[PDB]
Design a protein around this ligand. Structure first.
Ligand SMILES: Nc1ncnc2c1ncn2[C@@H]1O[C@H](COP(=O)(O)O)[C@@H](O)[C@H]1O
Lengths: 101, 101
């Protein structure tokens, strides 16, 4: 019932960059940088506070795969996640912004 | 030889928020938010690209401890790290910015 959950469940399309049994990455429809990707856990979790360390290890691994696929790994990129509406979170599913440019 | 490495060693003082065997947190001397903390690995690592997943699991755990000590865990916060000079990294030691709303 939420925009990223809809993507996970395949209700709405996206520009998929990379996908894993536990994670999914895709382009942001309103880019804030030359390359702007989003990395999300397929599991239903709302923000960074609700991710286990074990899973963030696997996400870190997945993040390296994304930035390397995008070819910005060595050029340089920003890693960002907003925890809660007061820190600017708009969609309530854990997601990391990857920007480079 | 570098400003955060000096803090780790402990050549220059800081406003230590929390510390443990592998990580250290402290306030940023030029805040960009009401609460602005930095989380750094004591191990000599330059940026996010050079952290192992295993260690980022333990850092995630450590990050939860700092935001809860700062009392912004539930109010809301931003998590940011810059990878490389081209993404705005100024100090060349892996660090996560924790900003508050
Ligand atoms: N249908 C969608 N597909 C891809 N990205 C989206 C969609 N709807 C919103 N977004 C992005 O998700 C982000 C929401 O902001 P935030 O919650 O602060 O990370 C924004 O950067 C939006 O551009």
């Amino acid at each position: 019932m939420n925009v990223f959950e809809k993507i996970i469940q395949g209700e709405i399309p996206c520009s998929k960059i990379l996908e894993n049994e536990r994670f999914l990455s895709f382009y942001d429809i309103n880019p804030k940088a030359k390359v702007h990707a989003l990395v999300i856990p397929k599991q239903s979790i709302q923000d960074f506070n609700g991710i286990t360390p074990e899973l963030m290890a696997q996400m870190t691994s997945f993040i390296f795969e994304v930035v390397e696929k995008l070819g910005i790994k060595e050029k340089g990129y920003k890693l960002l996640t907003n925890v809660g509406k007061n820190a600017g979170q708009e969609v309530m599913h854990l997601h990391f912004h990857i920007l480079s440019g």
